Nucleic acid binder design. Structure first.
Lengths: 107, 188, 81, 109, 64, 81
RNA sequence: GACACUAAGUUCGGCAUCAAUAUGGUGACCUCCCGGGAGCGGGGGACCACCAGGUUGCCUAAGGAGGGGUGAACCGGCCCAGGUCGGAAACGGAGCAGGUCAAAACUCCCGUGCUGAUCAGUAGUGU
RNA sequence: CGAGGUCCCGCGUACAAGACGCGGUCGAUAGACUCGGGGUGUGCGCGUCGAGGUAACGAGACGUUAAGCCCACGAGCACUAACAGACCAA
């Protein structure tokens, strides 16, 4: 029941039809499922990385380009896990904003 | 169907045309348009052909051959046998286009080369005219500034053509057109 | 494809006489190259033999050569007549 | 001259005569234990996958005197073939290397 | 290697000769294989020679 | 101590000599000569040597062409090695 | 007679052939939402290109919403085997090869504009 | 913003390279062919004669034959080649 977050969703180098889900203004260079998980897990979000899954609209097969990330929004009872994270859009955006800060990118 | 008479100016197209239709002589002037009339053939069934006399003038010869060629069952290319020696090049050049036009046709018309004006003493024979015309068309297919004549590697000859081509002799001045009426009958 | 009369052989007298034959062979090649822009210069052996008939020194003043062009690229193939 | 289409065709003929396969085991001269075991089903599935990769190639690449060369000069072509056949870039270079070794021996044949 | 000096001295005069004619044969067959490219194992065709030398050396020291 | 026979010489030429003239070709050492080659050959392959012809090389060895008797005949002797 | 100039004739290429609009399409791209565990399902705006037949500018000497072709390894659009990806599945997606085309682009041949060249040598005028 | 020029091509009244001069289809610049003008001295073949010789054979003579062969000159002649096209330039 967790939700799905594919890097294509947060890629500013992709068009709409190519899988982008957020405005280019907020999108990111080349987000990696890893980075996505690393910023989500570090906010109190319950999430696990599906390293080998591949996004259907992703012609490339490389690594930097594949993997999937799963985050728990609601809890079995119904309450959101983190009030500040209603929707999926909420997480996508939060991620798009925090990755360009990861030390590994400011390097 | 139609039998087209073509050839340089003064080769005798109109006089032959008259002789075939009336058996008589008549004065003529350079033709400026085509003329036509029905000819009842000499054979038993007496088939009818439409003889069409075409002007030989350079400014009209092709315009009119183009206009009537698809209606032709046969073409009679008339040659002044007495003036042949000086006119060879002009004759071959016109015949060249006539050979080409004829072959590009769905049902190629039968073609005769009527060596006319035999009644004049200095007249070259049909045998000699055929020989000199072959030699001349042979040079023309090379110098001629894709349908072509015979085989490129073998000296040109009328027999190499995908067309029935005959040569005969005649005189429009009564006249001596027996062979011509024989051929016209034969192709009717 | 046409028949042509190669002089340029006359020019071969401007070279000494014991070598006229090679000069000849070159002139024919250049003649047919020229006139005849679309004409490569393969010279059938018959032509070579013609010029060399009376030896290296006694080339004729003229040769009649039959030559053929194919049209695309500019070749020529040429022989004696 | 051994092209990539030629290799494609040989693969078709080899797969076709595979079943058949019972009769072949009933003929002497093939030494001891002729086709036993047992790796004829896996082996044919391999040829079929290579065929699917060549299905992503075009006529120029297939009828080229040296199909491997056409990809050395235009490595962009390798990427396309791989995309269309659901295979990786390395898999296509592997096929190309195998084709190279195959064609070598065919002229040595 | 596989055949040591102690083991050669251990053997009887007759066993050295029998061992000798044995090594020669291994050798001869190795050279045949090498003919006729030999499957092998270069370290041995060389050892066979030294083995034979040792045996002959010992046969001499012992007085046969 | 050195051995007489070194190894068979296998070559196209050695094959023709085996098949058609019935001989065997060996590499021996240099100074075996010729008697010694004949004897060595016999005792190794259990045969009758009719003649031996020898050549130094170059190879740094020596080559011996050893012809056997007709009943020995040679294709067979060589086949077992 | 011999030449010129305008009008003009023949022929093969001769040269040359707008602009701005509504409605409906196709495509591309962006931007907002709802639903959903994925592949997605659903709905609102914006921009650009092109097409179908339809106007008008007050537009040029002419300028028709004509008819083909090619479509390129990929790099136009469709349909997409196989394989690939998401899916337990049902299916769905990206998509090469292959096929295809009112609607990327590029090109011919057609009426109309310029326009090389060719042939004729007539009509007038002038020397 | 096109006067001219270089390259180019065919040749020399010019010339070791370079330079110079001429012509380039609105053309006779070079070659071919024909003729003119020239050089040698009468061709191959055949016919007759020929000292003789059974004959075979036969040096040579005459005729055909001002022949034959040849020309670094001229003319006629666009057949062939001077094409195609490039570049520089206030």
């Amino acid at each position: 029941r967790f939700i799905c977050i594919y890097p294509a969703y947060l890629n500013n180098k992709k068009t709409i039809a190519e899988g982008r889900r957020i405005p280019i203004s907020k999108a990111v260079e080349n987000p990696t499922a890893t980075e996505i998980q690393d910023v989500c897990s570090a906010v109190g979000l319950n999430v696990f990385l599906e390293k080998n899954k591949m996004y259907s609209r992703e012609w490339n097969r490389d690594v930097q380009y594949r993997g999937r990330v799963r985050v728990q929004l609601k809890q079995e009872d119904g309450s959101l896990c983190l009030v500040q994270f209603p929707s999926r859009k909420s997480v996508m955006l939060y991620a798009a904003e925090m990755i360009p800060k990861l030390k590994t990118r400011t390097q | 169907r139609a039998v087209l008479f073509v050839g340089l100016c003064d080769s005798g197209k109109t006089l032959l045309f008259v002789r075939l239709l009336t058996g008589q002589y008549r004065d003529t002037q350079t033709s400026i348009t085509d003329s036509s009339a029905i000819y009842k053939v000499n054979n038993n069934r007496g088939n009818s052909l439409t003889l069409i006399d075409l002007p030989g003038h350079e400014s009209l010869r092709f315009q009119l051959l183009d206009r009537f060629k698809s209606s032709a069952r046969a073409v009679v290319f008339v040659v002044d046998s007495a003036a042949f020696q000086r006119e060879v090049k002009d004759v071959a050049e016109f015949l060249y286009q006539v050979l080409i036009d004829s072959m590009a046709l769905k049902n190629s018309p039968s073609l005769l080369i009527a060596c006319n004006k035999q009644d004049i003493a200095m007249a070259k024979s049909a045998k000699l005219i055929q020989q000199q015309l072959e030699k001349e068309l042979n040079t023309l297919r090379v110098t001629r500034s894709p349908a072509q004549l015979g085989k490129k590697g073998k000296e040109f000859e009328f027999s190499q053509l995908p067309l029935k081509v005959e040569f005969l002799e005649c005189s429009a001045k009564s006249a001596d057109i027996q062979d011509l009426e024989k051929w016209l009958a034969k192709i009717a | 494809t046409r028949e042509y009369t190669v002089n340029l052989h006359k020019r071969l007298h401007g070279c000494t006489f014991k070598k006229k034959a090679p000069n000849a062979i070159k002139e024919i090649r250049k003649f047919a190259q020229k006139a005849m822009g679309t004409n490569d210069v393969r010279i059938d052996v018959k032509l070579n033999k013609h010029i060399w008939s009376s030896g290296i020194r006694s080339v004729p003043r003229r040769v009649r050569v039959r030559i053929a062009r194919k049209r695309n690229d500019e070749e020529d193939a040429k022989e004696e007549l | 001259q051994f092209t990539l289409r030629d290799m494609y065709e040989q693969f078709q003929n080899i797969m076709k005569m595979g079943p058949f396969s019972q009769i072949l085991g009933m003929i002497p001269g093939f030494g001891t234990d002729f086709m036993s075991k047992g790796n004829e089903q896996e082996s044919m599935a391999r040829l079929k996958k290579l065929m699917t990769i060549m299905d992503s190639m075009n006529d120029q690449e297939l009828d080229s005197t040296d199909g491997a060369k056409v990809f050395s000069k235009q490595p962009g072509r390798i990427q396309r073939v791989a995309r269309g056949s659901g295979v990786s870039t390395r898999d296509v270079q592997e096929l190309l290397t195998q084709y190279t070794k195959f064609a070598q021996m065919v002229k040595k044949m | 290697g596989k055949v040591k000096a102690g083991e050669l001295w251990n053997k009887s005069k007759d066993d050295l000769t029998k061992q000798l004619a044995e090594l020669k044969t291994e050798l001869g067959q190795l050279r045949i294989q090498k003919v006729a490219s030999s499957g092998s194992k270069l370290n041995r065709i060389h050892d066979i020679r030294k083995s034979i030398a040792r045996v002959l050396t010992v046969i001499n020291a012992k007085q046969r | 101590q050195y051995q007489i026979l070194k190894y068979p010489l296998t070559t196209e030429s050695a094959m023709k000599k085996i098949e058609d003239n019935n001989t065997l070709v060996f590499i021996v050492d240099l100074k075996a000569d010729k008697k010694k080659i004949k004897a060595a050959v016999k005792k190794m392959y259990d045969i009758q040597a009719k003649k031996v012809n020898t050549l130094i090389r170059p190879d740094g060895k020596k080559k011996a062409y050893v012809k056997l008797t007709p009943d020995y005949d040679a294709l067979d002797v060589a086949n077992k090695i």
